[PDB]
Every structure is written in C-alpha cells, then in structure tokens.
Amino acid sequence: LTTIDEVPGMADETALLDWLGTMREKQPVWQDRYGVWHVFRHADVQTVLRDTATFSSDPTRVIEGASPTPGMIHEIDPPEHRALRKVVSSAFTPRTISDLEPRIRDVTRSLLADAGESFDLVDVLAFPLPVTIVAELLGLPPMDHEQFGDWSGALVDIQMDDPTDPALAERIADVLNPLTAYLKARCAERRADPGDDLISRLVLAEVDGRALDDEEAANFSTALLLAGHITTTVLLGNIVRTLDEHPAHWDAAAEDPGRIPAIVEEVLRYRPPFPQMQRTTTKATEVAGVPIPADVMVNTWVLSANRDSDAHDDPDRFDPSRKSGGAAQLSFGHGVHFCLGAPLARLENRVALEEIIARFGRLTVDRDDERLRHFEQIVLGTRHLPVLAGSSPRQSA
Ligand code: HEM
Ligand SMILES: CC(=O)N1CCN(c2ccc(OC[C@@H]3CO[C@@](Cn4ccnc4)(c4ccc(Cl)cc4Cl)O3)cc2)CC1
Numbered sequence: 001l002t003t004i005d006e007v008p009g010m011a012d013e014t015a016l017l018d019w020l021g022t023m024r025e026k027q028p029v030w031q032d033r034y035g036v037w038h039v040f041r042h043a044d045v046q047t048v049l050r051d052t053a054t055f056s057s058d059p060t061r062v063i064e065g066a067s068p069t070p071g072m073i074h075e076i077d078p079p080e081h082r083a084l085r086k087v088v089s090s091a092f093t094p095r096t097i098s099d100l101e102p103r104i105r106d107v108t109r110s111l112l113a114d115a116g117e118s119f120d121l122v123d124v125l126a127f128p129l130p131v132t133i134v135a136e137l138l139g140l141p142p143m144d145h146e147q148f149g150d151w152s153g154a155l156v157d158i159q160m161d162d163p164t165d166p167a168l169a170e171r172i173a174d175v176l177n178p179l180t181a182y183l184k185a186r187c188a189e190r191r192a193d194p195g196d197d198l199i200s201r202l203v204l205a206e207v208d209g210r211a212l213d214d215e216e217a218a219n220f221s222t223a224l225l226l227a228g229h230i231t232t233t234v235l236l237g238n239i240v241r242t243l244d245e246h247p248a249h250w251d252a253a254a255e256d257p258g259r260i261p262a263i264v265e266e267v268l269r270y271r272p273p274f275p276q277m278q279r280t281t282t283k284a285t286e287v288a289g290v291p292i293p294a295d296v297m298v299n300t301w302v303l304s305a306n307r308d309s310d311a312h313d314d315p316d317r318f319d320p321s322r323k324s325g326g327a328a329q330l331s332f333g334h335g336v337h338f339c340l341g342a343p344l345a346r347l348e349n350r351v352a353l354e355e356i357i358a359r360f361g362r363l364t365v366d367r368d369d370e371r372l373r374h375f376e377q378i379v380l381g382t383r384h385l386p387v388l389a390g391s392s393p394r395q396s397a
Helices: 013-026 041-051 080-091 095-097 099-113 121-126 128-138 150-155 165-193 199-205 213-245 247-254 257-270 302-306 342-360
Strands: 029-031 035-041 118-120 276-281 284-288 290-292 295-303 387-390
Touching: 013 302, 041 276, 041 284, 041 295, 041 302, 080 199, 095 342, 099 121, 099 128, 099 342, 118 121, 121 128, 121 213, 121 342, 128 199, 128 213, 128 342, 150 213, 165 199, 165 213, 165 387, 199 213, 199 284, 213 257, 213 342, 247 257, 247 342, 257 342, 276 302, 295 302
Parallel strands: 035 295
Antiparallel strands: 029 035, 118 387, 276 295, 284 290
16 A cells, blocks of 8 residues: 555556455545545445435535536436436336337347448447437437547547546536537427427426426436437447357357346446446545545445445356345446436347347457557446457358
C-alpha cells in the first residue's frame, strides 16, 4: 500500500482484477488523488447503493447550479424518483417488452444471414440490432447514423479523468442536447396523435396526477436510446468473448437452448458492462469503519463485488450452472434505481445468442490482425469483436 495512484485502466482486465482483489483485502475503501472514493467489497457496494439518503444519485448536488435534468430518472433521488419511476414503469411494461421477441428474432436472423464467415460482431449485429429494436419500440423512424454509436462513442470517449471537473457536465450536454431536441420534437408529434409506441405511452402516462412534460419525456427517451446504443452492444461482445474462453458451453447450449438464460446471467456477473456506479455523499458517513466526508463522490465497484469470494464461491470461475440462493443481479444495480430495462436486455441477448448458435454453432474471436480494442474507461468490453464462424449454412460440397 502506497500513496501513488495507479488503477490499472479497464483495457488491461487481468491487471485490473488483481488490483481489485488486493484492494478488497487491504484497502476496501479508498480515496484517490481527486478526492473520489472507491468501494470494493460486495456488502459495502450493496450498503452504498441501497442508502439513497446518505448516497445520492444527483451528481449536481454539489455544483453551484442545482440543475437536476428533469426526467433523468437515474440522477434523481426520492421522493421525486419514486413518482417518476411509477410514471415510466406504467408505459414501459413487461407485456410491451415481451411482445418484442418476434421482431428481435427477425432482425437478428436477417443481420446474421448476410454476414459471411468472418466479420465484426459489433458492426454486424451487436450494434444495429438494439438500435433498431429500441427505435421501433420508441416509435422512431430508422436512423442514418451508424459507426458503432458515433454519438454514443463520443459519449463514452468523453475527454475525462477528474470527475470533479465542472467542464465534464458541459461536454456531456454538448453530445446529448441535439439528440434530446430531436426527441422532444418526436414527443410533441405523438402528443398531437398518440399511437401505442413507447413515446405515446410515455406522454399519456399518469400516475397520481404526475405526468411527464415534453422536457421530461424527451430526456427520458434520450436515456432509453442511449441505453439501446451501448448496453447490448457491450454485453453481447462480452458473452461471445467469454464463451470463446470456455468453448464447451457452445455445444451444451446447442443441445439445450434452455441453458442460454443462465449463460447470460453468468457473463453479467463475470463481465459487467458497467463495472462502476457513482454516488455523492449528502453527509459525513462511514463505510467499513472508514470515515467519508460530506459532498464527495463515491464509486461502487460492481466488478469487484462480483468477483468477491464472500459473495460467491470460486468467483473467478465462469460457471453458468451456479445456482444462487436468491439470484439477484448486481450488474443491473441494487435498490430503487435497479435497471428498468433489465428484461429487455435479457431478451435481446438471449435471442441474439440463440440465433448465433442456430446459424453458426459457435463463434471464436479472431486475433489475426490485432488485439482487441477495449474500452479504456466507462464500460467493460471491446469496441469491435472480429469473429470467425468455423461452420455456417454457406459451406458447400
Ligand atoms: C447489459 C445491459 C444493461 C445493464 C448491465 C444495465 C445496467 C444498469 C445499472 C447497473 C443500473 C443502475 C444505475 C445506478 O444505480 O446508478 C441501471 C439503471 C437503469 N437502466 Fe440499465 N442496464 C442494461 C440495459 C438497459 C436497457 C436496454 C435499458 C432501456 C432500454 C436500460 C435502462 C435503465 C434505466 C431507465 C435505469 C434507471 C432506473 C431508475 O433510476 O429508477 N438498461 N441499468
Ligand atoms: C474516473 C472515471 O473514469 N469514472 C468512472 C466511473 N464513472 C461513471 C460510472 C458509471 C456511469 O454510469 C451511470 C449511469 C448508470 O447507468 C447508466 C448506463 N445504463 C444505461 C442503461 N442501463 C444502464 C444509465 C442508467 C440509467 C439511465 Cl436513465 C441512463 C444511463 Cl446512461 O449510466 C457513468 C460514469 C465515470 C468516471
């Protein structure tokens, strides 16, 4: 233990993981050189995420401009979070998600049908599939944009190191503002003539007198669109990667496609698309007996918690057959901010992997030109994943 910050960056995962392990052991609550605090143990990550009074999700809590963006449900605390969550959950329903299955399968099947035997999984499927699905769910037209989220890439590639930096707020707003404005216009068109698409549902939604204005509906639809440009794109790459490291599971899921949901849960634990979540202390508190001051940022390492042997047995072992006494998925968060889109992600990744197996039996990652381009910061995964099918319906005698 020395007072010289490293943090292996995300790009070297094995080194990140060895660091996390040692911190879990020796420094479970750590303050970095920017005065940002880090929480590494499973039970402590849980404490933090649950306790919204002490640990607020409003980053703008500190900054002199009390600007909580309306309808940014992940950046809003009780009691307003509660009423907001109720309004959106009433538009964004299981039924609404589940009816998507046939379209999810149609799109996935057509995109793969054209891929050849050697392609980029991200450009071919992992990116265009959720973009298409989420737009259609929201009731938007098909978009012209596609470079693996030109704007969503800019977002995750933000000029950032010190999260205390006030500029950062502006750099984010710079990217999102054009997109939020475009959605605000779409919401106003649906307010005029509502359909059954999700934007119409959002605009008509009302729970205990609380309705979304076009500000809030546009903001929240923007978040949803962003979720669809990034999350499945990262998870599905992580799934193929991991299965490529334990390839016996390709054959097992081919024989019993009902094993697929469990593969997805396991990769979620093993490689969470989002390894860290962020909170701000609203008051002097302590974690693990470590005193933390008011008004500072706190990062909760979901990646650490997931590899913490006190939470799981043999935690670095990739094992889909691991029954869990109360399978609750920390990679989708913990508490009242628990992932609203969890069913949709589970559905898209299940259908995706099903369709990969049905056409190809298996894919392997292709490192025959370069090593993978990992995300350097926000998410845990790769920007591209060139793959190779050994088998496919194209092969002839
Ligand atoms: C692999 C896929 C996904 C992962 C790992 C994931 C992860 C997460 C996590 C960790 C949180 C909690 C954030 C916090 O506590 O600060 C969260 C919240 C949220 N996610 Fe996701 N998500 C995924 C897919 C999606 C999708 C597809 C959508 C919507 C289309 C979505 C929408 C949301 C929303 C709206 C919330 C916040 C709910 C609230 O604040 O009450 N997610 N997600
Ligand atoms: C030092 C350093 O690099 N820090 C690392 C960790 N920091 C960080 C960590 C996590 C993070 O994710 C925040 C939030 C939490 O989850 C999401 C990502 N997301 C999207 C759908 N499901 C999850 C999100 C949830 C809900 C909604 Cl409506 C929109 C979004 Cl988008 O971003 C954003 C930034 C960034 C700075």
